Structure 1
Amino acid sequence: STSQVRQNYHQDSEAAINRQINLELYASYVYLSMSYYFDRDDVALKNFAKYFLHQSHEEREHAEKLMKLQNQRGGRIFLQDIQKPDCDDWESGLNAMECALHLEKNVNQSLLELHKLATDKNDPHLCDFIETHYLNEQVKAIKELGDHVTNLRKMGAPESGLAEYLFDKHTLG
Protein backbone atom coordinates (compact mmCIF):
# COMPACT_ATOMS: atom_id res chain seq x y z
CA SER A 1 0.00 0.00 0.00
CA THR A 2 2.89 2.33 0.83
CA SER A 3 4.29 4.36 -2.06
CA GLN A 4 7.82 3.37 -3.08
CA VAL A 5 8.94 6.99 -2.67
CA ARG A 6 7.37 7.66 0.73
CA GLN A 7 9.86 8.45 3.49
CA ASN A 8 9.35 10.34 6.76
CA TYR A 9 5.89 11.48 5.62
CA HIS A 10 3.30 11.06 8.35
CA GLN A 11 -0.34 10.26 7.63
CA ASP A 12 -1.31 13.38 9.59
CA SER A 13 0.85 15.54 7.34
CA GLU A 14 -0.68 13.95 4.25
CA ALA A 15 -4.19 14.68 5.56
CA ALA A 16 -3.25 18.25 6.48
CA ILE A 17 -1.89 18.80 2.97
CA ASN A 18 -5.17 17.59 1.49
CA ARG A 19 -7.03 20.08 3.71
CA GLN A 20 -4.68 22.88 2.62
CA ILE A 21 -5.26 22.01 -1.04
CA ASN A 22 -8.99 22.40 -0.49
CA LEU A 23 -8.46 25.70 1.32
CA GLU A 24 -6.32 27.08 -1.52
CA LEU A 25 -8.93 26.06 -4.09
CA TYR A 26 -11.56 27.74 -1.94
CA ALA A 27 -9.52 30.96 -1.81
CA SER A 28 -9.15 30.86 -5.59
CA TYR A 29 -12.92 30.62 -5.89
CA VAL A 30 -13.51 33.48 -3.44
CA TYR A 31 -11.20 35.71 -5.47
CA LEU A 32 -12.94 34.68 -8.69
CA SER A 33 -16.28 35.76 -7.21
CA MET A 34 -14.83 39.10 -6.12
CA SER A 35 -13.28 39.75 -9.54
CA TYR A 36 -16.50 39.26 -11.41
CA TYR A 37 -18.37 41.32 -8.83
CA PHE A 38 -16.21 44.26 -9.83
CA ASP A 39 -16.88 43.38 -13.48
CA ARG A 40 -20.61 44.15 -12.97
CA ASP A 41 -21.93 47.12 -14.91
CA ASP A 42 -23.22 48.65 -11.66
CA VAL A 43 -19.80 48.37 -9.96
CA ALA A 44 -17.46 48.83 -12.93
CA LEU A 45 -14.04 48.85 -11.23
CA LYS A 46 -11.91 47.17 -13.89
CA ASN A 47 -8.66 47.24 -11.92
CA PHE A 48 -10.25 45.76 -8.79
CA ALA A 49 -11.56 43.02 -11.07
CA LYS A 50 -8.11 42.44 -12.57
CA TYR A 51 -6.45 42.43 -9.16
CA PHE A 52 -8.78 39.80 -7.76
CA LEU A 53 -8.63 37.64 -10.91
CA HIS A 54 -4.84 37.65 -10.62
CA GLN A 55 -5.19 36.59 -6.98
CA SER A 56 -7.59 33.80 -8.00
CA HIS A 57 -5.11 32.37 -10.49
CA GLU A 58 -2.27 32.67 -7.97
CA GLU A 59 -4.30 30.71 -5.40
CA ARG A 60 -4.91 27.99 -7.97
CA GLU A 61 -1.15 27.85 -8.54
CA HIS A 62 -0.62 27.44 -4.79
CA ALA A 63 -3.09 24.55 -4.72
CA GLU A 64 -1.39 22.83 -7.64
CA LYS A 65 2.00 23.19 -5.97
CA LEU A 66 0.59 21.47 -2.89
CA MET A 67 -0.77 18.66 -5.07
CA LYS A 68 2.68 18.32 -6.61
CA LEU A 69 4.15 18.15 -3.09
CA GLN A 70 1.67 15.44 -2.11
CA ASN A 71 2.71 13.29 -5.06
CA GLN A 72 6.42 14.03 -4.50
CA ARG A 73 6.22 12.68 -0.95
CA GLY A 74 4.14 9.67 -1.96
CA GLY A 75 0.95 10.79 -0.31
CA ARG A 76 -2.33 10.52 -2.17
CA ILE A 77 -4.47 13.50 -3.10
CA PHE A 78 -8.07 13.32 -1.93
CA LEU A 79 -10.13 16.20 -3.26
CA GLN A 80 -13.25 17.55 -1.58
CA ASP A 81 -16.05 19.85 -2.69
CA ILE A 82 -15.04 23.48 -3.17
CA GLN A 83 -17.57 25.46 -1.16
CA LYS A 84 -19.09 28.55 -2.72
CA PRO A 85 -17.89 31.89 -1.31
CA ASP A 86 -19.75 33.45 1.60
CA CYS A 87 -20.96 36.37 -0.52
CA ASP A 88 -22.44 36.94 -3.94
CA ASP A 89 -22.26 40.72 -3.54
CA TRP A 90 -19.05 42.11 -2.06
CA GLU A 91 -20.57 45.60 -1.54
CA SER A 92 -17.52 47.77 -2.21
CA GLY A 93 -13.86 47.85 -3.08
CA LEU A 94 -13.02 48.41 0.58
CA ASN A 95 -15.27 45.60 1.79
CA ALA A 96 -13.77 43.20 -0.74
CA MET A 97 -10.24 44.16 0.31
CA GLU A 98 -11.14 43.62 3.98
CA CYS A 99 -12.63 40.20 3.20
CA ALA A 100 -9.52 39.35 1.20
CA LEU A 101 -7.37 40.35 4.18
CA HIS A 102 -9.45 38.12 6.47
CA LEU A 103 -9.20 35.25 3.99
CA GLU A 104 -5.43 35.58 3.65
CA LYS A 105 -5.04 35.62 7.43
CA ASN A 106 -7.14 32.45 7.70
CA VAL A 107 -5.00 30.77 5.05
CA ASN A 108 -1.90 31.91 6.95
CA GLN A 109 -3.24 30.45 10.19
CA SER A 110 -3.82 27.13 8.44
CA LEU A 111 -0.26 27.23 7.06
CA LEU A 112 1.15 27.96 10.52
CA GLU A 113 -0.73 24.97 11.92
CA LEU A 114 0.61 22.86 9.05
CA HIS A 115 4.17 23.96 9.90
CA LYS A 116 3.59 23.16 13.58
CA LEU A 117 2.38 19.68 12.63
CA ALA A 118 5.38 19.12 10.33
CA THR A 119 7.73 20.20 13.13
CA ASP A 120 6.01 17.86 15.59
CA LYS A 121 6.44 14.99 13.14
CA ASN A 122 10.10 15.96 12.50
CA ASP A 123 9.45 16.53 8.79
CA PRO A 124 12.06 19.16 7.86
CA HIS A 125 11.40 18.82 4.14
CA LEU A 126 7.73 19.72 4.68
CA CYS A 127 8.65 22.53 7.09
CA ASP A 128 11.03 24.11 4.59
CA PHE A 129 8.55 23.63 1.73
CA ILE A 130 6.00 25.66 3.70
CA GLU A 131 8.57 28.25 4.75
CA THR A 132 10.02 28.72 1.26
CA HIS A 133 6.87 28.72 -0.87
CA TYR A 134 4.00 29.83 1.43
CA LEU A 135 4.74 31.72 4.65
CA ASN A 136 6.57 34.74 3.19
CA GLU A 137 4.07 34.89 0.32
CA GLN A 138 1.30 35.08 2.92
CA VAL A 139 3.07 37.76 4.98
CA LYS A 140 3.52 39.84 1.82
CA ALA A 141 -0.09 39.34 0.74
CA ILE A 142 -1.39 40.36 4.17
CA LYS A 143 0.85 43.44 4.25
CA GLU A 144 -0.29 44.48 0.76
CA LEU A 145 -3.97 44.03 1.58
CA GLY A 146 -3.55 45.95 4.82
CA ASP A 147 -1.89 48.79 2.90
CA HIS A 148 -4.79 48.81 0.42
CA VAL A 149 -7.40 48.86 3.18
CA THR A 150 -5.54 51.69 4.93
CA ASN A 151 -5.42 53.77 1.75
CA LEU A 152 -9.08 53.19 0.86
CA ARG A 153 -10.15 54.13 4.39
CA LYS A 154 -8.00 57.28 4.43
CA MET A 155 -9.33 58.24 0.98
CA GLY A 156 -12.90 57.90 2.25
CA ALA A 157 -14.05 54.52 0.96
CA PRO A 158 -16.63 53.14 0.72
CA GLU A 159 -18.85 56.19 0.86
CA SER A 160 -16.61 58.12 -1.54
CA GLY A 161 -17.09 56.43 -4.88
CA LEU A 162 -14.52 58.91 -6.12
CA ALA A 163 -12.18 57.36 -3.54
CA GLU A 164 -12.61 53.87 -4.95
CA TYR A 165 -12.43 55.21 -8.53
CA LEU A 166 -9.09 56.92 -7.93
CA PHE A 167 -7.69 53.97 -5.96
CA ASP A 168 -8.64 51.68 -8.86
CA LYS A 169 -6.84 54.03 -11.24
CA HIS A 170 -3.70 54.95 -9.30
CA THR A 171 -2.93 51.96 -7.04
CA LEU A 172 -4.41 48.96 -8.82
CA GLY A 173 -3.98 50.33 -12.34
Structure 2
Amino acid sequence: TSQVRQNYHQDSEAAINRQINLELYASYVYLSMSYYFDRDDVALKNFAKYFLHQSHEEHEHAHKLMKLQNQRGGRIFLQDIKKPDCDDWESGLNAMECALHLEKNVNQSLLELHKLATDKNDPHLCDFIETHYLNEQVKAIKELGDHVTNLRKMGAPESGLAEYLFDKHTLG
Protein backbone atom coordinates (compact mmCIF):
# COMPACT_ATOMS: atom_id res chain seq x y z
CA THR A 1 0.00 0.00 0.00
CA SER A 2 1.07 3.59 -0.66
CA GLN A 3 2.77 5.35 2.24
CA VAL A 4 0.53 8.41 1.76
CA ARG A 5 -2.76 6.51 1.47
CA GLN A 6 -5.22 7.39 4.23
CA ASN A 7 -9.02 7.03 4.22
CA TYR A 8 -8.96 6.31 0.47
CA HIS A 9 -11.27 3.42 -0.44
CA GLN A 10 -10.57 1.17 -3.41
CA ASP A 11 -14.05 1.88 -4.81
CA SER A 12 -13.26 5.60 -4.76
CA GLU A 13 -10.00 4.93 -6.62
CA ALA A 14 -11.81 2.91 -9.30
CA ALA A 15 -14.49 5.58 -9.67
CA ILE A 16 -11.78 8.24 -10.02
CA ASN A 17 -10.16 6.22 -12.81
CA ARG A 18 -13.54 5.92 -14.56
CA GLN A 19 -14.04 9.68 -14.22
CA ILE A 20 -10.59 10.31 -15.71
CA ASN A 21 -11.54 8.22 -18.74
CA LEU A 22 -14.87 10.06 -19.03
CA GLU A 23 -13.18 13.48 -18.96
CA LEU A 24 -10.70 12.40 -21.64
CA TYR A 25 -13.58 11.11 -23.77
CA ALA A 26 -15.42 14.43 -23.36
CA SER A 27 -12.30 16.31 -24.45
CA TYR A 28 -12.09 14.05 -27.51
CA VAL A 29 -15.75 14.69 -28.39
CA TYR A 30 -15.23 18.45 -28.11
CA LEU A 31 -12.14 18.17 -30.33
CA SER A 32 -14.20 16.34 -32.95
CA MET A 33 -16.87 19.05 -32.84
CA SER A 34 -14.32 21.86 -33.06
CA TYR A 35 -12.68 20.46 -36.16
CA TYR A 36 -16.10 19.72 -37.65
CA PHE A 37 -16.80 23.45 -37.58
CA ASP A 38 -13.37 24.09 -39.14
CA ARG A 39 -14.49 22.27 -42.31
CA ASP A 40 -14.70 24.30 -45.51
CA ASP A 41 -18.35 23.27 -45.97
CA VAL A 42 -19.25 24.36 -42.41
CA ALA A 43 -16.88 27.29 -41.81
CA LEU A 44 -18.10 28.51 -38.40
CA LYS A 45 -14.80 29.60 -36.89
CA ASN A 46 -16.05 30.78 -33.48
CA PHE A 47 -17.98 27.53 -33.00
CA ALA A 48 -14.68 25.73 -33.62
CA LYS A 49 -12.89 28.03 -31.17
CA TYR A 50 -15.57 27.48 -28.52
CA PHE A 51 -15.43 23.69 -28.80
CA LEU A 52 -11.61 23.70 -28.85
CA HIS A 53 -11.64 25.70 -25.61
CA GLN A 54 -14.11 23.19 -24.15
CA SER A 55 -11.79 20.33 -25.15
CA HIS A 56 -8.86 22.09 -23.46
CA GLU A 57 -10.93 22.56 -20.26
CA GLU A 58 -11.96 18.88 -20.24
CA HIS A 59 -8.29 17.93 -20.56
CA GLU A 60 -7.51 20.17 -17.57
CA HIS A 61 -10.24 18.42 -15.57
CA ALA A 62 -8.74 15.02 -16.43
CA HIS A 63 -5.29 16.26 -15.39
CA LYS A 64 -6.62 17.49 -12.04
CA LEU A 65 -8.27 14.12 -11.42
CA MET A 66 -5.00 12.30 -12.15
CA LYS A 67 -3.18 14.64 -9.77
CA LEU A 68 -5.78 13.86 -7.10
CA GLN A 69 -5.32 10.13 -7.67
CA ASN A 70 -1.58 10.48 -7.09
CA GLN A 71 -2.09 12.75 -4.06
CA ARG A 72 -4.28 10.22 -2.23
CA GLY A 73 -1.98 7.27 -2.94
CA GLY A 74 -4.23 5.73 -5.57
CA ARG A 75 -2.87 4.30 -8.80
CA ILE A 76 -3.89 5.65 -12.21
CA PHE A 77 -5.09 2.99 -14.66
CA LEU A 78 -5.68 4.49 -18.10
CA GLN A 79 -8.10 2.90 -20.56
CA ASP A 80 -8.87 3.34 -24.25
CA ILE A 81 -10.41 6.69 -25.13
CA LYS A 82 -13.38 5.73 -27.30
CA LYS A 83 -14.00 7.72 -30.45
CA PRO A 84 -16.94 10.16 -30.43
CA ASP A 85 -20.40 8.96 -31.40
CA CYS A 86 -20.53 11.08 -34.57
CA ASP A 87 -18.11 12.33 -37.20
CA ASP A 88 -20.59 14.81 -38.70
CA TRP A 89 -22.35 16.97 -36.09
CA GLU A 90 -24.73 18.36 -38.75
CA SER A 91 -25.18 21.91 -37.35
CA GLY A 92 -24.18 24.33 -34.65
CA LEU A 93 -27.47 23.72 -32.85
CA ASN A 94 -27.07 19.94 -32.96
CA ALA A 95 -23.50 20.23 -31.68
CA MET A 96 -24.66 22.47 -28.83
CA GLU A 97 -27.42 20.01 -27.91
CA CYS A 98 -24.95 17.11 -27.98
CA ALA A 99 -22.56 19.11 -25.79
CA LEU A 100 -25.39 19.79 -23.33
CA HIS A 101 -26.20 16.07 -23.20
CA LEU A 102 -22.52 15.22 -22.69
CA GLU A 103 -22.11 17.78 -19.90
CA LYS A 104 -25.21 16.47 -18.13
CA ASN A 105 -23.83 12.92 -18.40
CA VAL A 106 -20.52 14.07 -16.90
CA ASN A 107 -22.43 15.88 -14.15
CA GLN A 108 -24.40 12.73 -13.35
CA SER A 109 -21.16 10.75 -13.15
CA LEU A 110 -19.71 13.37 -10.79
CA LEU A 111 -22.84 13.23 -8.63
CA GLU A 112 -22.52 9.44 -8.39
CA LEU A 113 -18.85 9.92 -7.46
CA HIS A 114 -19.83 12.37 -4.72
CA LYS A 115 -22.44 9.91 -3.44
CA LEU A 116 -19.81 7.15 -3.33
CA ALA A 117 -17.33 9.39 -1.51
CA THR A 118 -20.01 10.37 1.01
CA ASP A 119 -20.89 6.71 1.56
CA LYS A 120 -17.19 5.93 2.12
CA ASN A 121 -16.77 8.86 4.56
CA ASP A 122 -14.02 10.50 2.47
CA PRO A 123 -14.57 14.22 3.16
CA HIS A 124 -11.45 15.26 1.23
CA LEU A 125 -12.76 13.62 -1.94
CA CYS A 126 -16.21 15.17 -1.43
CA ASP A 127 -14.69 18.63 -0.96
CA PHE A 128 -12.46 18.13 -4.00
CA ILE A 129 -15.47 17.28 -6.17
CA GLU A 130 -17.58 20.15 -4.82
CA THR A 131 -14.81 22.74 -5.12
CA HIS A 132 -13.52 21.83 -8.58
CA TYR A 133 -16.23 20.06 -10.59
CA LEU A 134 -19.85 20.51 -9.46
CA ASN A 135 -20.19 24.28 -9.89
CA GLU A 136 -18.16 24.19 -13.11
CA GLN A 137 -20.58 21.58 -14.47
CA VAL A 138 -23.61 23.62 -13.39
CA LYS A 139 -22.22 26.74 -15.08
CA ALA A 140 -21.35 24.80 -18.24
CA ILE A 141 -24.82 23.25 -18.42
CA LYS A 142 -26.45 26.65 -17.91
CA GLU A 143 -24.28 28.22 -20.63
CA LEU A 144 -25.03 25.43 -23.10
CA GLY A 145 -28.74 25.70 -22.32
CA ASP A 146 -28.60 29.43 -23.00
CA HIS A 147 -26.80 28.80 -26.30
CA VAL A 148 -29.35 26.17 -27.34
CA THR A 149 -32.27 28.44 -26.43
CA ASN A 150 -30.83 31.37 -28.38
CA LEU A 151 -30.06 29.22 -31.43
CA ARG A 152 -33.57 27.74 -31.43
CA LYS A 153 -35.20 31.16 -31.08
CA MET A 154 -33.08 32.65 -33.88
CA GLY A 155 -34.32 29.92 -36.25
CA ALA A 156 -31.43 27.44 -36.31
CA PRO A 157 -30.60 25.02 -37.87
CA GLU A 158 -32.78 25.72 -40.92
CA SER A 159 -31.84 29.42 -40.94
CA GLY A 160 -28.15 29.55 -41.81
CA LEU A 161 -28.22 33.29 -41.10
CA ALA A 162 -29.16 32.45 -37.51
CA GLU A 163 -26.09 30.27 -37.01
CA TYR A 164 -23.86 32.82 -38.76
CA LEU A 165 -25.07 35.67 -36.55
CA PHE A 166 -24.83 33.54 -33.40
CA ASP A 167 -21.28 32.62 -34.43
CA LYS A 168 -20.40 36.30 -34.81
CA HIS A 169 -22.25 37.90 -31.90
CA THR A 170 -22.41 35.32 -29.10
CA LEU A 171 -19.41 33.06 -29.72
CA GLY A 172 -17.31 35.86 -31.25
Q: Same fold (TM over 0.5)?
A: yes
- Following TM superposition, by how much is the alpha carbon of 1:112 offset from its aligned partner in structure 2, in angstroms? 0.0
Deviation at 1:91, TM superposition (A): 0.2
The whole-number CA distance in structure 2 between the counterparts of 1:161 and 1:37 is 16
Distance 2:170 2:121 in 1: 43
Shift of residue 131, structure 1, vs aligned partner: 0.1
Runs of 4+ in 1 over 6 A off after TM superposition: none
1:44-63 per-residue CA deviation (whole Å, 9 max, x = no partner) reads 00000000000000000000
**Displacement after TM superposition at 1:144 (Å):** 0.1
Structure 1 residue matching 2:97: 3-state secondary structure: helix
Q: Secondary structure at the match of 2:114?
A: helix
Q: CA deviation at 1:13?
A: 0.1
Gap regions ≥5 residues in structure 1: none
How many angstroms does 1:36 deviate by? 0.1
Query: Following the alignment from structure 1 to structure 2, what is the Cα–Cα distance between the partners of residues 57 and 78?
Result: 21
Deviation per CA, 1:133-155, whole angstroms, max 9, x where unpaired?
A: 00000000000000000000000
Structure 1 residue 30 displacement after superposition: 0.1
- SS of residue paired to 2:36: helix
Mapping for residues 19-168 of structure 1, pairs under 5 Å: 19-168=18-167
Give distance in 1, aligned partners of 2:120 and 2:85. Answer: 34
TM-score, length basis structure 1: 0.99
CA distance in 2, matches of 1:10, 1:161: 52
Unpaired runs of 5+ in structure 2? none
Q: CA deviation at 1:70?
A: 0.1
In the TM superposition, what is the alpha-carbon distance from 1:21 to its structure 2 partner? Answer: 0.0
Q: Deviations over 1:88-127 (max 9, x none)?
A: 0000000000000000000000000000000000000000
Three-state SS of the structure 1 residue aligned to 2:170 is helix
Q: Distance in 1 between matches of 2:29 and 2:120?
A: 32
What are the superposed Cα offsets for residues 63-91 of structure 1, whole Å, 9 maximum, x if unpaired?
00000000000000000000000000000
Equivalent pairs, count: 172
Deviation at 1:11, TM superposition (A): 0.1
Structure 2 residue matching 1:172: 3-state secondary structure: coil
Shift of the alpha carbon at 1:16? 0.1
